[PDB]
Amino acid sequence: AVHLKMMPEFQKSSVRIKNPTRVEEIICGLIKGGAAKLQIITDFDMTLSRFSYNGKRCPTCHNIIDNCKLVTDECRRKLLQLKEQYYAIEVDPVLTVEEKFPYMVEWYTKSHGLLIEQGIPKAKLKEIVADSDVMLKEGYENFFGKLQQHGIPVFIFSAGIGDVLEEVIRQAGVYHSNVKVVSNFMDFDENGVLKGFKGELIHVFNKHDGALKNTDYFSQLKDNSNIILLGDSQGDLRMADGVANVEHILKIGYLNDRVDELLEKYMDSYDIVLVKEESLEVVNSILQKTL
Ligand SMILES: O=S(=O)(O)CCN1CCN(CCS(=O)(=O)O)CC1
Numbered sequence: 001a002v003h004l005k006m007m008p009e010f011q012k013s014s015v016r017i018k019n020p021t022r023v024e025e026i027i028c029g030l031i032k033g034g035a036a037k038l039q040i041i042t043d044f045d046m047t048l049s050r051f052s053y054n055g056k057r058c059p060t061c062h063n064i065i066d067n068c069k070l071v072t073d074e075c076r077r078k079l080l081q082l083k084e085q086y087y088a089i090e091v092d093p094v095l096t097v098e099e100k101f102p103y104m105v106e107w108y109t110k111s112h113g114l115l116i117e118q119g120i121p122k123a124k125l126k127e128i129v130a131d132s133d134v135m136l137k138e139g140y141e142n143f144f145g146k147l148q149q150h151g152i153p154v155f156i157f158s159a160g161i162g163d164v165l166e167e168v169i170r171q172a173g174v175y176h177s178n179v180k181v182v183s184n185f186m187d188f189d190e191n192g193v194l195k196g197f198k199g200e201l202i203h204v205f206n207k208h209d210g211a212l213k214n215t216d217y218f219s220q221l222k223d224n225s226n227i228i229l230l231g232d233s234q235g236d237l238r239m240a241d242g243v244a245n246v247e248h249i250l251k252i253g254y255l256n257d258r259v260d261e262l263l264e265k266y267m268d269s270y271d272i273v274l275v276k277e278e279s280l281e282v283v284n285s286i287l288q289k290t291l
């Protein structure tokens with residue numbers, strides 16, 4: 001039997017849970033299925049990586065390139081203007097999420113277009129990442145470690161930049177064979193210089209589309225009918241839309257900012273809400289019981 005009251009990780013003040021009885025029954029099912037039935041579906045930026053550090057906001061994978069030595073101050077000025085204009089639409093309470101779709105396509109196309117003009121070589125991504133301020137959430141080594149030990153499928157589905165994300169986890173020593181990355185991947189020219197992005201754009205609000213376009217992955221994992229989903233946006237809730245069969249799914253959401261505005265909505269839509277929480281200890285505690 002599962003009792004959250006007796007799990008110390010669940011007593012942290014960052015832990016908000018609307019329906020603890022329901023959470024216990026989902027976790028109960030996760031434990032029952034063990035390793036053989038488990039898979040993880042997660043975004044990257046601000047979920048696996050930190051939102052802030054020492055009162056200073058940490059970079060998204062996109063920001064790692066924005067802030068690097070290969071990008072000029074005038075470009076960063078334009079990237080910031082794009083962000084100020086378009087982020088206001090992202091967080092706009094009046095527009096429906098569907099209405100925000102074209103605006104997100106514009107923002108990401110325009111910001112990716114600014115990076116392309118700056119001339120980013122593939123060979124420099126290692127240095128750029130090593131010199132960046134990116135941080136993984138506390139407990140990432142045990143997170144990735146226990147999962148790889150038990151061969152648990154991990155699907156990292158990111159609206160960020162796939163090449164950057166991959167370099168982050170590679171340098172962290174946690175890009176193991178069980179980890180599949182679906183993101184916006186760079187397209188390089190004959191000289192190994194960024195000229196564009198591959199495939200269909202993934203942004204904060206269209207992850208449903210990509211979830212369905214990964215049938216290959218999810219049908220291979222038909223038996224993995226128990227899911228742990230980790231997100232930090234409302235859009236991350238769509239990341240399991242491609243899952244073959246669902247027996248139990250637990251949804252854990254990092255609420256990193258806009259806390260007063262979003263808390264009620266997060267508590268209604270995620271089973272577990274982690275408020276201004278920079279660790280993976282709650283998910284790790286569930287894995288400890290399950291694996
Ligand atoms: O062998 S099986 O795979 O069938 C289930 C055993 N598995 C191994 C470790 N235990 C004890 C950790 S805890 O319950 O103290 O967290 C959790 C579940």
Ligand SMILES: [Mg+2]
Pocket residue numbers: 043044045046047231232233
């Ligand atoms: Mg994110």
